[PDB]
Amino acid sequence: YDDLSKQAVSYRQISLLLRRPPGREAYPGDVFYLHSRLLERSAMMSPQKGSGSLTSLPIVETLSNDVTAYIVTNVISITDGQIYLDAKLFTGGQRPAVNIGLSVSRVGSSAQNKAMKKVGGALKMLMGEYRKMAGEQTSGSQNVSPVMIRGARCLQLFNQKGPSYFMDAIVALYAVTNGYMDDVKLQYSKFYEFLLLNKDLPVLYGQVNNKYFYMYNKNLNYFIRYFGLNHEILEPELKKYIEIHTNLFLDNYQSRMNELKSDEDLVQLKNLLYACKRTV
Amino acid sequence: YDDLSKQAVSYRQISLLLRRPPGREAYPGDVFYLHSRLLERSAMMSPQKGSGSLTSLPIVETLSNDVTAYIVTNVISITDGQIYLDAKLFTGGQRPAVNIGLSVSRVGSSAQNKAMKKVGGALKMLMGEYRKMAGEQTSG
Amino acid sequence: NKVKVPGRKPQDEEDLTWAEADRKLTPEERYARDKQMALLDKMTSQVEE
Amino acid sequence: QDPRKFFPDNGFRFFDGPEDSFGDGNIPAQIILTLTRQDEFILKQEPVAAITIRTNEGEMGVLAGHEYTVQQLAPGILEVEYEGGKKDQYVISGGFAHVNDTGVVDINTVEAVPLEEIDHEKLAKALEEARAKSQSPDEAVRIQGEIALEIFEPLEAALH
Amino acid sequence: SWRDAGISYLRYLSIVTRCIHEVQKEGPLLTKNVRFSTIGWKSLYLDHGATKEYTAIPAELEKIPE
Amino acid sequence: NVAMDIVEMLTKYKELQDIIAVLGIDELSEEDKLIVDRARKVAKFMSQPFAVAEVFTGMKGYYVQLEDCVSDFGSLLMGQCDNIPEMAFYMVGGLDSVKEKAAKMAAEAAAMRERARKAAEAK
Amino acid sequence: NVAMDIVEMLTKYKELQDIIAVLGIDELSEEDKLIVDRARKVAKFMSQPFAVAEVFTGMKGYYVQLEDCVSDFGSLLMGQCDNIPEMAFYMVGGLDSVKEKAAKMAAEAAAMRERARKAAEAK
Amino acid sequence: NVAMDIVEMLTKYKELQDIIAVLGIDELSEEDKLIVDRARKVAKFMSQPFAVAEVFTGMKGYYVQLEDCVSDFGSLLMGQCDNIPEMAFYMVGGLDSVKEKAAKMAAEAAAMRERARKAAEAK
Amino acid sequence: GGGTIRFWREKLEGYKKYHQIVKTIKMVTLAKYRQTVVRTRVRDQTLRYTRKALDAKTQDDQEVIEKSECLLYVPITTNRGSCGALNTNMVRYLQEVENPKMTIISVGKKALDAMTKVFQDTYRRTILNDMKQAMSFQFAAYVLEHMNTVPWDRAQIVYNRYHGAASQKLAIFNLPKFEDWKQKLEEDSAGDGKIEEDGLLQSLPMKTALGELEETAVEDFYNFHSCLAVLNAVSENELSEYAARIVAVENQL
Numbered sequence A: 001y002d003d004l005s006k007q008a009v010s011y012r013q014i015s016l017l018l019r020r021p022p023g024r025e026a027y028p029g030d031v032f033y034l035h036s037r038l039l040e041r042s043a044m045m046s047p048q049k050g051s052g053s054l055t056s057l058p059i060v061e062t063l064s065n066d067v068t069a070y071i072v073t074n075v076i077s078i079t080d081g082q083i084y085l086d087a088k089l090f091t092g093g094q095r096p097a098v099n100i101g102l103s104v105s106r107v108g109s110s111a112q113n114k115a116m117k118k119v120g121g122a123l124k125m126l127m128g129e130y131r132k133m134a135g136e137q138t139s140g141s142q143n144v145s146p147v148m149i150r151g152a153r154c155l156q157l158f159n160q161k162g163p164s165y166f167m168d169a170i171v172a173l174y175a176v177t178n179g180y181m182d183d184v185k186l187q188y189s190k191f192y193e194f195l196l197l198n199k200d201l202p203v204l205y206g207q208v209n210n211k212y213f214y215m216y217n218k219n220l221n222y223f224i225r226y227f228g229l230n231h232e233i234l235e236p237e238l239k240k241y242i243e244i245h246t247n248l249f250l251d252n253y254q255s256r257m258n259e260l261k262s263d264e265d266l267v268q269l270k271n272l273l274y275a276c277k278r279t280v
Numbered sequence B: 001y002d003d004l005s006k007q008a009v010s011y012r013q014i015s016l017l018l019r020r021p022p023g024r025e026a027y028p029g030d031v032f033y034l035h036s037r038l039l040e041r042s043a044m045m046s047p048q049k050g051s052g053s054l055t056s057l058p059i060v061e062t063l064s065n066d067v068t069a070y071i072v073t074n075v076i077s078i079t080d081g082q083i084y085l086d087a088k089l090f091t092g093g094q095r096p097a098v099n100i101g102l103s104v105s106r107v108g109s110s111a112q113n114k115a116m117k118k119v120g121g122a123l124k125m126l127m128g129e130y131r132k133m134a135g136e137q138t139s140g
Numbered sequence C: 001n002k003v004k005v006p007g008r009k010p011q012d013e014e015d016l017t018w019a020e021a022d023r024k025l026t027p028e029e030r031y032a033r034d035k036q037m038a039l040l041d042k043m044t045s046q047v048e049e
Numbered sequence D: 001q002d003p004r005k006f007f008p009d010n011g012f013r014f015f016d017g018p019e020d021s022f023g024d025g026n027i028p029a030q031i032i033l034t035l036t037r038q039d040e041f042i043l044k045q046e047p048v049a050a051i052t053i054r055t056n057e058g059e060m061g062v063l064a065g066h067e068y069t070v071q072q073l074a075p076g077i078l079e080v081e082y083e084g085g086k087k088d089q090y091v092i093s094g095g096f097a098h099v100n101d102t103g104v105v106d107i108n109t110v111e112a113v114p115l116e117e118i119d120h121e122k123l124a125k126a127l128e129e130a131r132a133k134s135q136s137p138d139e140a141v142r143i144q145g146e147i148a149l150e151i152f153e154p155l156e157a158a159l160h
Numbered sequence E: 001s002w003r004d005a006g007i008s009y010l011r012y013l014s015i016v017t018r019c020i021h022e023v024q025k026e027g028p029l030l031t032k033n034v035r036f037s038t039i040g041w042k043s044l045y046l047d048h049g050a051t052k053e054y055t056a057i058p059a060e061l062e063k064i065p066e
Numbered sequence F, G, H: 001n002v003a004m005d006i007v008e009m010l011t012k013y014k015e016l017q018d019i020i021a022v023l024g025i026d027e028l029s030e031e032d033k034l035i036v037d038r039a040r041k042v043a044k045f046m047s048q049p050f051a052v053a054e055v056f057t058g059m060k061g062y063y064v065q066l067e068d069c070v071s072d073f074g075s076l077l078m079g080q081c082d083n084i085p086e087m088a089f090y091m092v093g094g095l096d097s098v099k100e101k102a103a104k105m106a107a108e109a110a111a112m113r114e115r116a117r118k119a120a121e122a123k
Numbered sequence I: 001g002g003g004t005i006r007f008w009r010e011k012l013e014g015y016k017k018y019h020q021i022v023k024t025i026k027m028v029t030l031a032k033y034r035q036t037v038v039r040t041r042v043r044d045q046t047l048r049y050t051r052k053a054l055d056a057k058t059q060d061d062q063e064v065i066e067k068s069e070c071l072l073y074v075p076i077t078t079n080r081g082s083c084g085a086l087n088t089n090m091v092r093y094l095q096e097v098e099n100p101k102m103t104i105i106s107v108g109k110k111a112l113d114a115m116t117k118v119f120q121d122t123y124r125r126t127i128l129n130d131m132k133q134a135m136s137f138q139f140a141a142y143v144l145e146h147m148n149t150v151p152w153d154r155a156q157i158v159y160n161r162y163h164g165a166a167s168q169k170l171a172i173f174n175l176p177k178f179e180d181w182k183q184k185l186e187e188d189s190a191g192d193g194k195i196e197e198d199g200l201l202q203s204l205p206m207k208t209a210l211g212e213l214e215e216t217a218v219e220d221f222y223n224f225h226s227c228l229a230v231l232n233a234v235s236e237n238e239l240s241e242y243a244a245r246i247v248a249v250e251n252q253l
Helices: A003-017 A031-039 A070-076 A114-133 A147-157 A165-176 A184-196 A201-205 A235-258 A263-279 B004-017 B031-039 B068-077 B112-136 C027-049 D120-135 D137-160 E009-023 E026-035 F001-019 F032-047 F066-079 F093-122 G001-019 G030-045 G066-077 G095-122 H001-020 H030-047 H066-078 H093-122 I004-037 I038-042 I048-054 I061-067 I084-094 I137-148 I178-190 I204-212 I213-249
Strands: D031-036 D041-047 D050-055 D057-060 D069-073 D075-081 D087-092 D095-099 D105-109 D111-115 E042-046 I074-077 I104-107 I123-128 I154-164 I167-176
Touching: A003 D057, A031 A070, A031 D075, A114 A165, A114 C027, A147 A184, A165 A184, A165 A235, A184 A235, A184 A263, A184 I178, A201 A235, A201 H001, A201 I204, A201 I213, A235 F001, A235 I204, B004 B031, B004 B068, B031 B068, B112 I004, C027 F001, C027 F032, C027 F093, D031 D050, D031 D075, D041 D075, D057 I178, D069 I204, D075 D137, D105 I213, D120 D137, D120 E009, D137 E009, E009 E026, E009 I137, E009 I213, E026 G001, F001 F032, F001 F066, F001 I004, F001 I154, F032 F066, F066 F093, G030 G066, G095 I154, H001 H030, H066 H093, H066 I084, I004 I038, I004 I213, I038 I137, I048 I167, I048 I204, I074 I084, I074 I137, I084 I154, I084 I167, I084 I213, I104 I137, I123 I137, I137 I213, I154 I213, I167 I178, I167 I213, I178 I204, I178 I213
Parallel strands: D031 D105, I074 I104, I074 I154, I104 I123
Antiparallel strands: D031 D041, D050 D057, D050 D075, D069 D095, D075 D087, D087 D111, D095 D105, E042 I123, I154 I167
């Protein structure tokens, strides 16, 4: 549902022209029951009724980042969660501009999957620890904590333009929470992911000891989605893929990157990193 | 009176349901005159009238330490003084949690006794300086 | 040579900060982490001793 | 870039040192004393009739028109004598005395306290401590006791 | 004597000053003067991101630099 | 008395975030830093994992009895547990669980320290 | 990319304005004051004279071309032009005009210094 | 003119009272301490009694005319009445009455001196 | 609209609390300034023979760099901020004077984060006096013992001179090297007395009488006077800090 505030302006027009009494912010008063009737139809139906479902992703415009307007409160009271998009972060560079402090979900682990439950349980703790430190201008540049590193890398990974496959996300977040992407600098956090998902380095550089685990098939997702990476068979192969990817990266690409001093090559690299932020 | 803010809400209900013209914060205009009908009956009577007296201690609840509200501004405009309690002091062990700077009695010393005027003048000259000193000193 | 200011560009240094996190509580967090690390190190020594 | 926006002053120039004289042919009648502890003076260009300093070579005595001589001050006492015949004794902790032919004295020290601010009772305790420290065979304590005794012995001799 | 032991003239002056501060009477002047002998300072130097003490030149007067 | 003392401490805690935000922790007395750390431990300690919040927390709930609920807060009120770290109080029940979590965190910290030692030994 | 980086820089400058107006620029880290000087140069550069406003700005109007606008902002973004003062970016179009204005201002400031020297000598 | 000069004097005295609490009265120049004394005299001179309260406090009231007040404040601004102390101006009306108070103060001090001197000399 | 008014009310209370806090800082700094101003009556007398010994004509830089091998610049910064432009102007002077042969040993915490980000390799360390106990001759002895780690050929001690409560300007002490000072002392003791710079004093009799003085005593003379110079610098910067903080706090208010 695109802007429901417009759906309420239409109801206000209809009501007030029909000589209905106004209310708060000019609305008739029963504009809450409107969205209630609309959104309570969302459900995950019982097996008696076919195990069907329909998700609802209503959209509400906001004026100067206020959540005090009548319609916004009426809808937050109805909807389970919310995905708060802040202009200060959109304008602040990062896109999508979700604010985790104000965005929540009242379903949690039960919605997401086995493979994603463990990663989210790690990421929630990492972000709760990183929120307390991230306000500090990094001064202990070598004395920085692991959390300050992993949280920044995860925020880099959160930058997107389009969607991402499940297999193309769990591995990228696993490398962050487990610290495999700690030696590379922040700016290269997404070029790393691009090579991790679309340019298999061990298959290129010949370091192929893993039996099956490679990020080219796109069908391993349905094994991760069932067994989970925290399993006897996927965990060691995952480690013996990511560690060689990090090693080959740090050796060949990171070293070549830091050696750039020319303005032309530096800008070429800059545009490449932004492009990797976009496509991935 | 515990308390007149709710008396005002009741008057507002009675008025609006009877379609009396509304006003600020959906209160009628003469809601001030209501409390003046009441609080002005409090008085120290004359020696021609038995020398009786009626004191009043009207309570009025604030919200987020607001004093610019309508009922509060009216009762302050009416009363012969005021008492201002604070929650920041109620939580800090200062119970009663007064705010001496905002608490006022226009009846300053004529109410006090012979023994109390001296002590109260001393405590005023003490607290007026204690406030200036504690406000500017560090936490340490 | 002047300054290695951080930024989004690779020649610039890491910007580990997060605009979402508040700066008002940062000094209290710094002091808390320093005190906690000191206590943990002292506990390491006390457990060995 | 701005071409040298800053042009700092030399701090030496904020002081007013005496200018030495050759062949002036006039002898001062009374010196102009200036005693300074760590940074602050206790006396600024006071007329003084005489002064008496202690050194490693021995005790010296300065009067008006004394020859230009610059030398250490051994840690001990320092006597000033005004034109009125009175006196003022000061304990010091090293320094350098700069005398002038024109009649100026700059006794720059690290400390300067009158004898009146010292008590013999408190001194007697420090004496045996410094002595027994000198007895202890250890380079860290022996030298410290020697220095403390070096400053205390003239005090114990002068208070008596 | 203390000369060849390595300690400089200025540490010797400071020790004599500390002794004079010990012996002198209780009063305002001693309150002014104890400040001029007590040891509170340090040295420090920045690592890549952290602080570290440069303890090669000690503040305590008994010791000798190396 | 314990409740009123905690409520009296937290108001000073507010008045001291008012200051630390500007000056810094260095510009407060040690008697003030003590109550700052105590209130900072109390605020994190009064957090509690619930059995219903297993979905969000991923941690089993704890049922804290009232008597233990006073002995623990009073022990923290009078400095009886100041050597214990701060985060050990985060999202636990009684004081026994706090000491368990402190022992845990010290174990993982020694693990990171010796792993850094072995990483320096390796390269 | 240049536009997004410019917008990010101005976002940080807006957050730092809350401190600059209260304390001052001196209480910022070296990185932050560099970011402030750069964002101030960006904001001043964003202004340009128009032919319509010749009555007011007292300057001939410029038509900054699109291709020349990106290279200028990118050079101002990569630190390629930091020795230029801030006021050189005010009410100009293109970095070449900025350098011309900086030359004019430097010449005028020098000439004022030699004029003051001549006046002091004659004084 | 007299009123505007008094307003300027009082504004300057406020600025200097925002310094005396900082530095001290000796930090000011010889001109500034003069206007400080004059402004204190002016402020004490504004204090006027009232015939309304004459029964309560006992002191008389003074109905001072307009032009006489102008001549008084002009004399006090011109400095031709500066030898008079500050406390004489307190709670009086007109320059022709503060002089009575000053004569009373001087005679009372002389009487205390005569009393004390003879009391010490007799013993 | 309720969120807007609540936000503005919270910002109002924040500014009020911030105001009284800054007012408290002003009171503390005022107490320290009223203590330290007692020095102003008594200063300006201890360094005059030090001037006479160490001072030389204004030597242009570019010749000093070619003459020398490792200069030294000692900036005396503060321990805590809200001072003004003292630290920033010191850093600006040094990056104005920056040359391949320099080394920086500073005094203060604010010289630790700033200089290291401007001067990567030349900056070495700093010295910190927690000002609970007033500075001393042995603090300057500590600073000399730190400076002497280098075989420096010239030491430019930068500091802030307190001309008045509204005037805290820069100032420098250009200290020579001991061996060079002794050689210049001899070469100027031989020839006649002729000043080569206005405002400079003749000291030929002093430069002879020091020749009458033995070697160890002349080394002690040098070190003692350099220590007094450092001490005057520290005291003047202390007072300048406490005087400029009031200005940089009233403007904040």
